[PDB]
Design an enzyme around this catalytic site. Structure first.
Site, PDB file in Angstrom:
ATOM      1  CG  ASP A 323      51.570  61.809 -31.446  1.00  0.00           C
ATOM      2  OD1 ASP A 323      52.349  62.748 -31.715  1.00  0.00           O
ATOM      3  OD2 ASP A 323      50.454  61.678 -31.993  1.00  0.00           O
ATOM      4  CD  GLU A 352      54.268  65.449 -29.647  1.00  0.00           C
ATOM      5  OE1 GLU A 352      53.342  64.620 -29.766  1.00  0.00           O
ATOM      6  OE2 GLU A 352      54.821  65.997 -30.625  1.00  0.00           O
TER       7      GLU A 352
END
Ligand SMILES: [Ca+2]
Ligand SMILES: [Ca+2]
Ligand SMILES: [Ca+2]
Ligand SMILES: [Ca+2]
Lengths: 662, 662
Positions: A323, A352
């Protein structure tokens, strides 16, 4: 004093254990600058140096290659090389530029006067490779709180008295026990990889506010249930990926609270970036999301030597989805790759990255891949907002030209953060059938958001809301087979079985033949088979194929010999061409020595390699690869900056790749 | 929280007293942002505001025009307008962007959370115009310490026991009394403007380290000698420009020493940018050159209400050359222009901007012009380093397309900071004759470094040295008529008398006909005469003129009727065409009303103006100007965003200029 600017400009951005790494530095100065220097490290220690005297690491000089004076300011160019390093080595380096017979120094990018406040650059020395299973992987991204509730006894924070607008942003009760129960359905879908939403002990049902990096929230279950899930999913030959949050914690994390009260007498004060006025570094101004300082030595050791092995080695996950990979530094990800790829080089690490593809490219060499947001952006605007099929082709073509061949772009239509495709396409499932089909017929690793295959969409409009617009992307999975869109499910199962039974559809070259707006035909090359794909989201039309060849609709076992084809309206199909293509039997090397050098095949890999040719440094070689005494690779070039006995490799999937690997 | 970015993007970058000023702001945000705001001021007060509540000034809102989501980040575009302001008005404004139903705000460019640490933008509302005398000005830039020693009694810091290498960086004794004596020679040269090197009481002979902004160093003389010089130069109808240093002082300045000892109890502590660790803002790391903080309110008042009028109003200078105009802010120069142009709008204010022409353009509207460093860079490489004459044309063409027509680019070949042209051209005075001739036949305001006309060059190589390479650009002027290059002097006097007697050579349009490497022919348009210039620095060649017309060598009163011409080798000439061009007699306006509207001439200016036509807001008008019922200006366009009775103006020198001035 000046403007030193390096900006991670090392010549082999993904260095092998053989090539040296050329560091080029641009300086915009007023007074003199005569020479600089590199202070690089080989272990994990932080590099530091000044004016040619290295504090921790070796020294390499920066020498003025070019210089002039433009608009009364002097512009010089410094260059130096870092010596070649062994395989699996993390090179961190810092760069400064000064003036001989002067007083002081000035460092790179930050223009700092000391090494401590300078940019710390890094790269990883390794034959860069991504796990081969991650290339063929079809991923089922589930939001754990919204999948299935296999145990209502773990729903401590679920308030059943809440409305849907109030419960969709709170806890609903989905747990890891439910993923265990519905594991047969996931396997029936055909996916070979499961991506699990974060399970950290946090104050929110999404799990992106960790208060314990190495602890599962009781609202999702226990470690034993997670160990049981991962083991059961492993006995079915499926892989499990964990959504990992390394950049930040919540203000409720025991580390942050202890530092927020004890101050500098806290063991975790330097584990965050506290400022001298009470402010601290945070995630986009969210005071509840303080940025975990992975650039601190003792914190980087906690993340890498304690937290990461807990998920990859103890819980035996197969990979990590990261993330906000932009948060941490590249010098952290270089350390991160050395840690996870030493546990097992077949552990999928993709991030990400909220940035353009020209900046996602910088993550190559550190991560195995990334999430293709360009796929998402240029698929809603095409299949859900009625765009041009060229923006689909203009997306696939620029991925080949920019990304490293080992970089794995995971494609998706929806997210837990982006609106559902069905809702952006007006619940017109014919458009979602086109997008899901076109996706599984395009290069990349397809990701399926948990509800898409049964028509799960949005029960409300997100534009009507604020802050919590993402309620309606995280609605609960539907299991009532009457409320499910079984036509969509049987569609997803069939587009998976095709891609999972045609290697050209996963790891095959892409070539577009004809394409208009709301019309596209293309092919997928390989070495064992070829396929032709036709997709139209508008009226019926005819598209011009390059060659003329008989086809075979893989769904309806028919055939079709022709030079063109009339693709239907809002219809799609994939045809397999039939060719008795004589496979590779002999590969020779024409251009290095006086006569052609016949290469030998390597069955372990899929490459043809030379034997061991000596080359002079900076000698502009020029050569080609001939195939079975017929066709030939277009002329290549190579300069061996260091050494002699270099070897030539020919990967037929990437033939033009100049891989003169020692 | 986000990335607010305005970057001085106001739509009329040089606003008239009529048009509103559109503020467009780009924001890259994660969480919501719904609306922003402008907090602008009209007086000199500093603007401030927050979340629609202005602290000092009026408020104007920022509204989301466009928005989307790209790579999981939201990109919105905010827009708002500042109401039109009266003539001679300094508008300073600050910009923030926040989220309605949110907590806090975030400001422009700096991404600060408070108005105090935000970027302060500014522009000046005025019919922008530069002094007409500065357009035709030929400037003689003298280095006062190295011109003439009219009084040896003022040579307090001159050490005659020094060698040339040691004295060229120290004091040599040149004074303002010498400029008074050699004033006949300066007037004989033909220049109409004198640029004086800084005369501040400083520790260095160049005067760029001021220890007294309003005091003349005794090593140069007194104020009375300076007043006598300026008055005597005025009685000869010559202008005097002062080299002004507003950005920084020396560490020996009484202000800096008092702040360096007394600290915050000093009246001048905030007049510099002291940091909380003893460091202070400086000029390129030079600890002896602390940056004077012109952004402080009490310091900006000292510079503008005390220092500037001392030189322009008390000493009666005609203009200021601004050393390092990049140092101070644009909000300072907006205040600076309002101060100097209220004393006398015919006071030349041009700056030394070390930047590209795309960034020198931002100084337009605040300064009357700048020093054309692009002229310098692309003239040494052409005439002294043997380049292409296209880079000369590619320089003149891009000045017309980028710079405002009133912006005055002062061209030069040498500087007190750059190597002499004769030394960079190998003392080949034939190349300096070409450059000096081509310069005085090109648009701009020519500047003559003090020694160039008599062959003054460098007595040593600058590459052999360090730090003080600029010794050899500041060598002493030669007055022994045997040691002078009288051929070069008579050359400079003749190229001046031509430019000073041909208005087309000063303020005339430029058009290139043919040009090769080391060969160029071009013309200089006007409304009273035309000229053709031919220059070749190589072998003899022939260049193709567009039209066919008889010429007249202005030097040798001959003529030549032909369509081409053979320019000599290392030779040059300027020809005047002979045309009975019927001057402007009638101008009409075709496209606004049903029938053509005849314009009336204004003899004070040189324009044809309409009478008073009403227009609707945002109405796309489209029109043209016809000339004597024959040729016509190519179609224009205009939108009157505010008001009705707008007037049409036609400047025949800039015909395509859409100047629908109210
Ligand atoms: Ca997040
Ligand atoms: Ca949220
Ligand atoms: Ca200077
Ligand atoms: Ca110097």
């Amino acid at each position: 004093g000046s403007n030193v600017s390096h900006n991670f400009n090392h010549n082999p951005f993904i260095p092998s254990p053989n090539d040296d790494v050329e560091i080029t530095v641009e300086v915009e100065h007023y007074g003199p600058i005569d020479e600089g220097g590199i202070y690089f490290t080989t272990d994990g220690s932080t590099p530091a140096g000044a004016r040619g005297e290295a504090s921790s690491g070796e020294f390499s000089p920066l020498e003025v290659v070019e210089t002039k004076t433009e608009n009364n300011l002097q512009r010089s160019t410094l260059k130096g090389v870092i010596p070649k390093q062994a395989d699996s080595t993390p090179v961190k380096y810092v760069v400064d530029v000064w003036a001989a017979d002067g007083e002081g120094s000035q460092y790179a990018d930050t223009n700092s006067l000391t090494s401590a406040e300078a940019t710390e650059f890094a790269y990883y020395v390794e034959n860069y490779s991504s796990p081969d299973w991650a290339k063929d992987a079809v991923i089922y991204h589930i939001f754990v709180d919204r999948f299935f509730d296999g145990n209502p006894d773990n729903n401590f924070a679920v308030d059943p008295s809440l409305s849907l607008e109030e419960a969709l942003k709170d806890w609903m009760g989905g747990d890891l026990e439910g993923v265990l129960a519905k594991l047969d359905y996931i396997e029936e879908l055909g996916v070979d990889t499961i991506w699990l939403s974060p399970v950290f002990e946090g104050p929110y049902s999404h799990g992106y506010h960790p208060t314990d990096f190495m602890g599962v929230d009781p609202n999702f279950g226990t470690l034993e249930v997670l160990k049981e899930l991962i083991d059961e999913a492993h006995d079915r030959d499926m892989k499990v990926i964990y959504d990992f949050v390394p950049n930040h914690t919540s203000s409720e994390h025991p580390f942050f609270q202890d530092a927020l009260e004890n101050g500098e007498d806290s063991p975790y004060y330097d584990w965050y970036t506290f400022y001298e006025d009470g402010t601290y570094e945070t995630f986009y101004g969210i005071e509840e999301l303080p940025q975990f300082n992975n650039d601190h030595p003792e914190a980087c050791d906690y993340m890498l030597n304690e937290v990461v092995p807990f998920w990859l080695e103890e819980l035996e996950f197969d990979g990590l989805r990261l993330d906000y990979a932009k948060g941490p530094s590249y010098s952290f990800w270089v350390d991160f790759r050395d840690k996870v790829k030493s546990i097992d080089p077949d552990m999928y690490v993709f991030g990400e990255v909220w940035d353009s593809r020209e900046k996602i490219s910088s993550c190559a060499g550190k991560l195995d891949g990334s999430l293709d947001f360009g796929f998402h952006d240029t698929f809603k605007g095409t299949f859900a907002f009625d765009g041009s099929m060229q923006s689909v082709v203009n997306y696939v073509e620029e991925n080949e030209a920019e990304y490293h061949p080992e970089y794995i772009m995971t494609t998706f239509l929806d997210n837990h953060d982006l609106p559902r495709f069905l809702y952006e396409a007006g619940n017109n499932t014919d458009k979602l059938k086109l997008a899901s089909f076109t996706q599984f017929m395009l290069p990349g690793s397809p990701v399926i958001y948990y509800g898409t295959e049964v028509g799960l969409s949005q029960s409300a409009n997100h534009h009507e809301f604020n802050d919590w617009k993402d309620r309606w992307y995280r609605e609960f999975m539907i299991w009532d087979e009457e409320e499910q869109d079984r036509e969509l499910l049987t569609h997803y199962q069939d587009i998976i079985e095709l891609r999972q039974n045609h290697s050209a559809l996963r790891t095959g070259d892409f070539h577009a033949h004809s394409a208009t707006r709301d019309a596209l035909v293309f092919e997928r090359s390989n070495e064992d088979e070829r396929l032709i794909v036709a997709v139209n989201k508008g009226a019926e039309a005819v598209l011009a194929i390059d060659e003329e060849l008989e086809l075979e609709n893989l769904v309806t076992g028919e055939r079709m010999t022709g030079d063109e084809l009339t693709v239907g309206a809002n219809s799609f199909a994939v045809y397999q061409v039939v060719e008795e293509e004589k496979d590779i039997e002999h590969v020779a090397l024409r251009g290095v020595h006086a006569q052609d050098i016949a290469l030998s095949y390597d069955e372990a890999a899929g490459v043809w390699r030379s034997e061991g040719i000596h080359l002079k440094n900076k000698q502009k070689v020029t050569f080609e690869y001939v195939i079975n005494g017929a066709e030939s690779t277009r002329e290549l070039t190579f300069t061996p900056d260091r050494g002699g006995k270099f070897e030539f490799v020919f990967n037929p999937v990437e033939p033009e790749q100049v891989t003169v690997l020692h």
